[model samples]
Target: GTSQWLRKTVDSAAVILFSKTTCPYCKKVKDVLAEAKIKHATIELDQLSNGSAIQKCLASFSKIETVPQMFVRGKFIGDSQTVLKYYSNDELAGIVNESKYDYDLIVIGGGSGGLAAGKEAAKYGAKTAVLDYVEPTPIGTTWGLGGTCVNVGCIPKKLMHQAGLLSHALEDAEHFGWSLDRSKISHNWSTMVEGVQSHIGSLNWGYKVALRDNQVTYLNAKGRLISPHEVQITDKNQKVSTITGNKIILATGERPKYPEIPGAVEYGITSDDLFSLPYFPGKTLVIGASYVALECAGFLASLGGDVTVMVRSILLRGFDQQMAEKVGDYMENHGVKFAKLCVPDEIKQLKVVDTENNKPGLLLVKGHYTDGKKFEEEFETVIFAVGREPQLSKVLCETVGVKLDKNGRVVCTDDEQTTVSNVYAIGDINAGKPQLTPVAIQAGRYLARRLFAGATELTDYSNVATTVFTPLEYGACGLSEEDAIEKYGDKDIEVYHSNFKPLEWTVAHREDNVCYMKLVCRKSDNMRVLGLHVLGPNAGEITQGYAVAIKMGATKADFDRTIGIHPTCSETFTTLHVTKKSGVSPIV
Candidate 1:
């Protein structure tokens, strides 16, 4: 009998070849069968009209649309790639030669989203491979193998931020009547840095083991796009290898940026460098008034350093001005200095002043004003909290012909797909406002569903909330007062606001501490809440509820009707009932 009738003649075999004469994979399959001296059959479906009978039979049995579906004996095998994998490996070849079996699917990327994708794909019997690059891929700090959020970004930074927070709390315990000596609260920078590194290292190892246990291949190298379906990996020794897949997902994340300032190159440290510093400076000048700068100032000042924060113009330029200023004031009250509305001109090293011993102190020789005015001050260290930019250097986007925005973010449609078909990007690497970790996670999951699971739903990022975690936290959702007026006109908006010392502050005799809340709404709607802003302790925790209310289109009346929590700063969200004119209102 001809090879096409081999499946019919034999009860079962180790391979089933579904072929068309012109298909390359089909040719390869025929060659393999002939060389192995195995009796196998193939159907030349390209010769038949619609091949409806065969199609229906295969559809009922396989539930897949593509041709070249193979089987070994009574068990279903995979596509050409899987077959080649079996043929190339002696262990897999022995299994292929001995038994008939089927695979569910192969999924890759064992991250939260990757695991989910793999599980779902496995449910369909495709034998998924959840591949992750969890090591320092040969890209040299650009993109790690496991992904950005896992390797050098989110999780690590948040852990370190918590460490900084704990350090601050220990230092600030004196104010809470703990009566600990200031000298005893000294930070062990080397110890903490080593601990953080070790913790991340452990996590990295755990991710690899998890992938292996899950039956997923964890590739530990930099995966660069060689083609639409191929990724070229450069190992630690710069050896190149390649992998081809039916589909691909791009989840690479962002990196930190140091702004180009006059003295930034000489004195500035990015957020990354600040985390592992061996020593703390006696005095620090923080440039850029973003959340990074604000948090850094709070932490540094809490650690007993004299911190002076400088901003180019308005602090937290895009956030609610009142709340931003309140956070700035909170920092000032905690011994942090402010150099508002200033920029640096030139940086000169000042002669180190010998104090106590012959040790020298580092200092800045000069500074500049926004209006080009010059002055001089001394700071041992300067930090640039400018912002972050996407790390896409190794991605070889030009080779793939992908478009990027002016700021270097990969431009994608509302569905999160780049210009290239079947390719998608998510997280901070994509163009969007409010680049938070949660937002990235949401985007990544959403894209995974749409691209891999046939889901059509798009992510709704409107009214996504964020917070600057200063001592007196500032939180906002929806439009700010300025944004509301700019969009709907001043005459169309009503404002309600309040400022006072919190009850705890009063009881503790902290008169200088203040809390403020503001609500912006439409005048015609009798103050329907369009925005909610608060500046006080636990702003992030407090704002979360209001953010939900705003997402549900809660009006000012809804906030007013809600009962206030007794004696709590968050109660101000509901207690600010009186409406005032749109422009300026005084707070008692």
Candidate 2:
């Protein structure tokens, strides 16, 4: 009787959520309902009501003044966490379906942004649902659910990169006066992959459990836009369902793109495909000239593959060209053969000379710089590092009237909002920004705040730092010299550059290793650090700190005055001797 009366009282034609801006528990409840695909209207008691109204509402809701009080129909649904539980329950779906023709918001893509948006909507008590295609929704990683940053993008890549570093360091330890056996020391790729996979799996399951525990409805299917206010979901079995929301946030991430070579479909595989390879090939040919290609080439080379890298253009285009060239030299020195300035026109897979040898013969043709030359070679595998594109097509953007840039990126406003109101895009899908996982995550968080929390903040694209996971990492932030010169006259900017071996490398007798750092600044604003670039050990880690400073408008003088952390490669950032302080130096 109690349950029936409660349900009857809560069976509202309209529901309102009372929430506070900073309440995490309130966010949790909202995220749960969003995941469960339930929509409700929200009222911010803190923002709209006077103290008396807020107190009256709080007292009516159970004498609690904390944020995230919910009212279903006209009945109080308790606090944020309690409301989330109700929505996630099976009964909540039926109840919601019986009422509500319109919702204030519908969040698409159950990644971090979508989840946050959903939570904020719930806090606002706006009818909201978080939609995603990831199986076991709510996990923020690629392996299970969530999105790219948690699973296959940053976290996994960083872990594997770190492991590779440790392995390399151990091998180099002999030079550091530590005797170590190279034979007994080896990395188990399978074990490492499985371990990371398992950890991600647990987190994925935990996310679903949390969603269910909170009473958020979880739909495991790909969400496609049927209309601006409607989304069609296709489950694993190809069955389709429809969900409608007032607003949608597109947090769908990117996927690797393989080249269109003759034998690409037969022998070539993209980076994503490599993750599922049964075993690592002894010999590999990596195509493309971007950071992805370089990192993969370096990783495979470090993994003991006879690695060959084929670049369509000079390596590291749009980067410091000198630094780019240096990286190419570094790769060559480290056993990665560079097929400089060559575009693969065809890949002809030939029969294995002998099955017992486990080698496959192939003929590769280069049309551009190889003088249209055809060469025969044998390799166990081929990896295409052409780059990545957003998984936009899968979402059926045409139906939603979403405009894409010339480069096929979703066009968004300053707030990451797409042309269609209530729909936003982030990550690699958006044009006019670097395609880094961290950037995507930042975009996601910022968009969520603006959409749900009534915040008007926009992410500043300038001074966003990023890194490549090469053997010796490469970190970059701010504009390149070329861009700087193009924007500011050559006479208006100064360039400072330096190159040398690290102290640790000297002790290890590794003089061949090169450390390069560069700074670009306006000539008039000589002491203002406009850009910082590094290609050496811990480049990613080192640049991150500087990136923060740069974002805060730190000048070159600030960097000079900053105390160096001694005995470290990063210390070089601040302690470097000015090699060539020139006006409008070469872009490199």
Identify the leading candidate in terms of TM-score.
2
lDDT (CA) for every model shown? 0.63, 0.67
Model 1 compared with the native: what TM-score?
0.72
Q: Give RMSD to native, each candidate.
A: 10.5, 8.1
lDDT of 2 by residue, 1-588 (tens): 333322332332245466766678878877877787665655555675363465454554466766666665555656765665666565666554443434545556766555554554454344556666753211112345666656555666666667667866876788777878776876666677777677767867876776554445567678888778778888879997787765567767666675765777666666554543445556788878887778778877776668888776678777878778877787798888977667766776654323455344454434455667654565667777777776677785586788998777888888787888757777667788777656666676666544544344677787788787788788898888788889988878777776657776766667543777888888687557777889888787788878778888877777788888777778766754463643433221
Question: What is the RMSD of candidate 1?
Answer: 10.5
Q: Give the Cα-based TM-score of candidate 2 against the true structure.
A: 0.78
True lDDT of residue 154, candidate 1 = 54
Off by over 4 Å in 2: 1-105, 110-128, 134-143, 149-151, 183-187, 213-215, 351-370, 391-393, 397-399, 576-579, 582-588
lDDT of 1 at 115: 46
How many clashing pairs per prediction, in order? 24, 28
